[PDB]
From Swiss-Prot:
Interacts with CTR9. GO terms for biological process: cellular response to stress; chromatin remodeling; G1/S transition of mitotic cell cycle; negative regulation of transcription by RNA polymerase II; nucleosome assembly; nucleosome organization; poly(A)+ mRNA export from nucleus; positive regulation of transcription elongation by RNA polymerase II. Present with 8890 molecules/cell in log phase SD medium. The keyword Phosphoprotein applies. Its main location: nucleus. Disulfide bonds: none annotated. It is found in: Nucleus; Chromosome. This is Transcription elongation factor SPT6. It comes from Saccharomyces cerevisiae (strain ATCC 204508 / S288c) (Baker's yeast). GO terms for cellular component: euchromatin; mitochondrion; nucleus; transcription elongation factor complex. Histone H3-H4 chaperone that plays a role in maintenance of chromatin structure during RNA polymerase II transcription elongation thereby repressing transcription initiation from cryptic promoters. Mediates the reassembly of nucleosomes onto the promoters of at least a selected set of genes during repression; the nucleosome reassembly is essential for transcriptional repression. Essential for viability. Keywords: Chromosome, Nucleus, Phosphoprotein, SH2 domain, Transcription. The lineage of its organism: Eukaryota, Fungi, Dikarya, Ascomycota, Saccharomycotina.
Length: 879
C-alpha cells in the first residue's frame, strides 16, 4: 500500500516484479544505457562508464527505492549528471523512457523465464534449446517444443505423421535442421544425401493400393502440405529471415475499391516507404494503418530483394548436381517445399514487424503530444505590472455574437481571490454614432465601481477585433489608469477551456442560474489566474477530446492518457501545492492526484485525513507523526507539499520552502556557515540542538545579500561529498537560492495570443483553407466609393480592389455587374491576421490547379500507378 499509485496501477499486470538477479541487473543496465546512449548521440567512448553509472543510479532509485521521477530529478539530480557541467544530463523524457523500458524489460524477461520453466519442465536437454537459453523468437521456441515433444508435455502434421506417408520425408536424405544449421552458420556444414533407388511416385503408387487401410493425387498434395511445416518451424531459419527482413523492408501503399474513390485526391490520404523514413514522419504509418483498418488501402510489407534473398539462400544450401531423375525429383520437391514454407512464414513475420512498428510510432507520437501539452501548461499567472506585481483585479467580458446594440455585452468581475463578484451587462451600443458617450460612460462607471486591474476578451467571430479596438480607444479617451498611473492592459486570452467549461456540468452546478456568456467570462478570468488548475480540472473524456494535436485521435486512450498524465505530474511538481488550500479549495486541490506519490485511491484518503484532523498542519513532520502518510509516500512527496509562512514561534521558515526534510539539516548547516559562526559555537549549538536560531538570525540581519552570495557553493559541496560521501551540489544551490526569497516563481511568463493564433481562434478557418494565395468562394455584399466589399463562408472580410476585378480596367462602376445570391469564386492575395482583413482578386486570370501534393518520387510515391489511374479518373465518370 505504501507504493505510489501510478506504480501500483502499472505493476498490477506483472508479477514477481522485484525478482531479478545480478546478471539480469547488469544486462538490463548495459542495455538500457546503450539505448539511451544511442538516442543521446555520443561520440567515441565519451567516458561511457560515467553515463552507465548514472543509469545504474537512476534504475536503482526507480526500481528499488520506488522514487518517482520528479523527486529524482529535483533532489537526486546530482547523481544523474557528469561531475563536470555540460558533460551529460538525463532529462525527464529520459527518466520516463527508463521506467517504460524497465517495465517492458521485466515483462519480456518474465515470459523468457516462463518458457525456460516450460522447457526445463520437460527436463530434456537439447543442444539447440539449452544453448539458446544460455544468453537469457520466444514463441518460436514454444512452438518448437510443442511440435518436437508433443507427447513428453502431454502428461504435464500431427495426424499425417501417424500415417505411413512420413516415409517420403524420411527419404529426403537431409533433415530441415541441417539446412537451418547451415543457414545460421552461414556455411554448408551439412551437405544433403542422395536418394539412390526410389522416386517418391514409386512409394506413393506402391503404398496407396497396397496400404488401402492406412493410405489411399490427394496423397501427394497432402505430403506437400504437411512436410513444409518442418521447414517453417526451424528457429535458426526464421530468426535470420525475420532479422534481415526488418532491416530494409519496403512499405509501399496498395489501394482498394475505395482507393482514389473515397479520397478524391483532396484529403490527408493523398500520400516504397522505409522504416528509417518514418523516423521523421512517423504519423504517416499511423495514417496508413488507419486507412487499412477502415478498409481503404493496405500497406504491403516486403523485403528489398525478396526473390534474391530466398534463392541465394537455397542454391548455396540445397541445389543438387546429381543428374539422376530421382535426384531431380527430390530436388524439385525441396525447392517447392522451401519456397512454400517461406511464403507461409512471411505472413507471420510481417505481422510481427508491423505491430512492432505500430507500437514504436505510437509511442513516438505520444512523446510530441506530451511535449506540446507541456508547453501549454507551463504558463505563469499573468502579471499586470512588471515593476510591482501583485495579484491582479480582473474584469472579464465577451463580445458575444458581435451584434453591437443587440445580444447585450456580458462582463464579469473577479477579485484577487478568484471569486465571482458580479456580472455586468452593457446594452448600450459602443458604435452608435448618435450617442457613443452613453456606452463610454456606462463602461467607465463599471470600471469606477469595480476598479479592476486587467481586461480579458475572447469571442466566437472577428467582431471581437472591432470590440477590442473600441474598448482600447475608449479606455485611452477616459484616461483610465490604475494607481500605477498607467493604462489598464487589455489582452486577448485563450478560451478553449472556457468553452468546454461552460458546456460542462461542473459549471452548471457552480453557476446554476447564469447565462453561458457569464460562465465563459468566468473561465476566461480563471485562465488568466492559473492555467494549470484549469487544465487539471477537465474530466478524462473532455480533456481527451480537447484539440491538442491534429492526429491525437490516432493514439488510443491508454497511450494518450498516460502521456498527458506525465505532463501533469511534471508541471504540478514544478510548483508546490499549498496543502492548507488543498483541504478546502476543492477546485485548487483536485491537482493533488497528480502530485508525486499520490493518486485516485490515496487522494481521497489524504483529503479525508485532513478533514479528520480539523486543524491546519504546522510542520511537515506532522504528516508522519500522526501517521497521516507512510514512509515511502512521505519521502516521495514531502518535498513538494508546503506550508505557507506568516509573521507562532514553533513555525519554521523551511516549512514555506521547497526543501525536502532530509536536507533541512544541511540547510541549517550552510546557513550557519553563511553566518560565519565560530566552530566552537557550531559544536555547542548543535549539541544544544539550537540550529533553528541560525536561520532566524540570518532573517534578522539586513546584509543578507552581501553575506549569503559570498559563499562559494562548489567548495562546500566538494567538502560535503569528501566527508559524508553524498553528492548534493545542485540541491545546495537550490537551498541557497531559495534562502533569499521563498517560493520564487519558476514557470515562464504568460502567453498572450498574438496575430496568427488570434485570427485562428476568432475565425475557425484553418491555414489549409485561408492562407496567402488561396482561391475561395466569396460573397460580394457591399460596394464602396471605388472598391467592392465581400465576405467569406466564416464571415471573413475581403476587399476586391477596383483593378482586381476589371472594374477600374474598364469604364463605369462595377456595382451593376455583380449581384447577390450568386457565389463568386475569388483568389485571396494578401491576409492580415493582426488586422483581420484580406485583399482578393476576382479575375479569372488567377481565380480560374493543385496547390497541395506530397512526395512524387516514383519510388516514394508510385507515379506509374497515378498515371495508370489517370485513365480511370477519365473513364470513372462514365464507368
Amino acid at each position: 500500500t505504501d507504493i505510489p499509485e501510478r506504480y501500483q496501477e502499472l505493476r498490477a499486470g506483472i508479477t514477481d516484479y522485484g525478482n531479478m538477479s545480478s546478471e539480469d541487473q547488469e544486462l538490463e543496465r548495459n542495455w538500457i544505457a546503450e539505448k539511451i546512449s544511442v538516442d543521446k548521440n555520443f561520440d567515441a567512448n565519451y567516458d561511457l562508464t560515467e553515463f552507465k553509472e548514472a543509469i545504474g543510479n537512476a534504475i536503482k532509485f526507480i526500481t528499488k527505492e520506488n522514487l518517482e521521477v520528479p523527486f529524482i530529478y529535483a533532489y537526486r539530480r546530482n547523481y544523474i549528471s557528469s561531475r563536470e557541467k555540460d558533460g551529460f544530463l538525463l532529462t525527464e523524457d529520459d527518466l520516463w523512457d527508463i521506467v517504460s523500458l524497465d517495465i517492458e524489460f521485466h515483462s519480456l524477461v518474465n515470459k523468457k523465464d516462463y518458457v525456460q520453466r516450460f522447457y526445463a519442465e520437460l527436463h530434456i536437454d537439447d543442444p539447440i534449446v539449452t544453448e539458446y537459453f544460455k544468453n537469457q523468437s520466444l514463441q518460436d521456441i514454444y512452438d518448437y517444443l510443442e511440435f518436437k515433444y508433443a507427447n513428453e508435455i502431454n502428461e504435464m502434421y500431427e495426424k499425417f505423421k501417424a500415417s505411413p506417408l512420413y516415409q517420403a520425408v524420411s527419404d529426403i536424405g537431409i533433415s530441415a535442421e541441417d539446412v537451418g544449421e547451415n543457414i545460421s552458420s552461414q556455411h554448408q556444414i551439412h551437405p544433403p544425401v542422395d536418394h539412390p533407388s526410389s522416386k517418391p511416385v514409386e512409394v506413393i503408387e506402391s503404398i496407396l493400393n497396397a496400404n488401402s487401410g492406412d493410405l489411399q493425387k490427394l496423397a501427394i498434395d497432402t505430403v506437400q502440405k504437411y512436410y513444409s511445416l518442418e521447414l517453417s518451424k526451424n528457429t535458426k531459419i526464421r530468426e535470420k529471415v525475420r532479422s534481415d527482413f526488418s532491416k530494409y523492408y519496403l512499405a509501399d501503399v496498395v489501394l482498394t475499391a475505395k482507393g482514389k474513390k473515397e479520397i478524391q485526391k483532396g484529403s490527408l490520404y493523398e500520400d516504397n516507404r522505409t522504416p528509417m523514413h518514418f523516423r521523421r514522419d512517423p504519423d504517416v504509418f499511423l495514417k496508413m494503418v488507419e486507412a487499412e483498418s477502415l478498409n481503404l488501402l493496405s500497406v504491403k510489407l516486403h523485403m528489398s530483394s525478396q526473390a534474391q534473398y530466398i534463392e541465394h539462400l537455397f542454391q548455396i544450401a540445397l541445389e543438387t548436381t546429381n543428374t539422376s531423375d530421382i535426384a531431380i525429383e527430390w530436388n524439385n520437391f525441396r525447392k517447392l517445399a522451401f519456397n512454400q514454407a517461406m511464403d507461409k512464414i512471411f505472413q507471420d513475420i510481417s505481422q510481427e514487424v508491423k505491430d512492432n512498428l505500430t507500437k514504436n510510432c505510437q509511442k513516438l507520437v505520444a512523446k510530441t503530444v506530451r511535449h506540446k501539452f507541456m508547453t501549454k501548461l507551463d504558463q505563469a499567472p499573468f502579471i499586470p505590472n512588471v515593476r510591482d506585481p501583485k495579484i491582479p483585479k480582473i474584469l472579464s467580458l465577451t463580445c458575444g455574437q458581435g451584434r453591437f446594440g443587440a445580444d447585450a455585452i456580458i462582463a464579469v468581475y473577479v477579485n484577487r481571490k478568484g471569486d465571482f463578484i458580479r456580472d455586468y451587462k452593457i446594452v448600450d451600443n459602443p458604435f452608435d454614432k448618435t450617442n457613443p458617450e452613453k456606452f463610454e460612460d456606462t463602461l467607465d462607471n463599471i470600471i469606477q465601481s469595480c476598479q479592476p486591474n486587467a481586461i480579458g476578451i475572447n469571442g466566437p467571430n472577428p467582431k471581437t477585433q472591432k470590440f477590442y479596438k473600441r474598448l482600447q480607444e475608449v479606455l485611452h479617451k477616459k484616461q483610465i489608469v490604475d494607481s500605477r498611473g498607467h493604462t489598464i492592459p487589455i489582452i486577448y486570452v485563450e478560451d478553449e477551456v472556457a468553452i468546454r467549461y461552460q458546456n460542462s456540468e461542473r459549471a452548471a452546478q457552480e453557476f446554476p442560474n447564469k447565462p453561458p456568456l457569464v460562465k465563459y467570462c468566468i473561465a476566461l478570468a480563471r485562465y488568466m489566474h492559473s492555467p494549470l488548475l484549469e487544465y487539471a480540472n477537465l474530466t478524462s473524456e473532455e480533456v481527451r477530446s480537447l484539440s491538442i494535436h491534429p492526429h491525437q485521435n490516432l493514439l488510443s486512450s491508454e497511450q494518450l492518457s498516460w502521456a498527458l498524465e506525465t505532463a501533469f505530474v511534471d508541471i504540478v511538481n514544478l510548483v508546490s501545492v499549498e496543502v492548507n488550500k488543498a483541504t478546502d479549495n476543492n477546485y485548487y486541490a483536485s491537482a493533488l492526484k497528480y502530485i508525486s506519490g499520490f493518486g485516485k485511491r490515496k487522494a481521497i484518503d489524504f483529503l479525508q485525513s485532513l478533514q479528520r484532523l480539523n486543524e491546519p498542519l504546522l510542520a511537515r513532520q506532522q504528516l508522519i507523526t500522526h501517521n497521516i502518510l507512510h514512509k515511502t509516500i512521505f519521502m516521495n512527496s514531502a518535498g513538494f507539499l508546503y506550508i505557507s509562512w506568516n509573521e507562532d514561534l514553533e513555525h519554521d521558515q523551511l516549512d514555506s520552502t521547497r526543501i525536502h526534510p532530509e536536507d533541512y539539516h544541511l540547510a541549517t548547516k550552510v546557513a550557519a556557515d553563511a553566518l560565519e559562526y565560530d566552530p566552537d559555537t557550531i559544536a555547542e549549538k548543535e549539541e544544544q540542538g539550537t540550529m533553528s536560531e541560525f536561520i532566524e538570525l540570518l532573517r534578522e540581519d539586513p546584509d543578507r545579500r552581501a553575506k549569503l552570495e559570498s559563499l562559494n557553493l562548489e567548495s562546500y559541496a566538494e567538502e560535503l561529498e569528501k566527508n559524508t560521501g553524498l553528492r548534493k551540489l545542485n540541491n545546495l544551490n537550490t537551498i541557497v537560492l531559495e534562502l533569499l526569497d521563498g517560493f520564487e516563481e519558476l514557470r515562464n511568463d504568460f502567453h498572450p495570443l498574438q496575430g496568427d493564433e488570434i485570427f485562428q481562434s476568432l475565425t475557425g478557418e484553418s491555414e489549409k483553407t485561408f492562407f496567402k494565395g488561396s482561391i475561395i468562394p466569396v460573397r460580394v455584399e457591399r460596394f464602396w466609393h471605388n472598391d467592392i466589399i465581400c465576405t467569406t463562408n466564416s464571415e471573413v472580410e475581403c476587399v476586391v480592389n477596383a483593378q482586381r476585378h476589371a472594374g477600374a480596367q474598364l469604364r463605369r462602376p462595377a456595382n451593376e455587374i455583380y449581384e447577390i445570391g450568386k457565389t463568386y469564386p475569388a483568389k485571396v492575395i494578401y491576409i492580415d491576421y493582426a488586422n483581420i482583413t484580406a485583399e482578393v482578386s476576382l479575375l479569372d486570370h488567377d481565380v480560374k490547379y493543385v496547390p497541395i501534393s506530397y512526395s512524387k518520387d516514383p519510388s516514394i510515391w508510385d507515379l506509374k500507378q497515378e498515371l495508370e489511374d489517370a485513365e480511370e479518373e477519365r473513364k470513372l465518370m462514365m464507368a
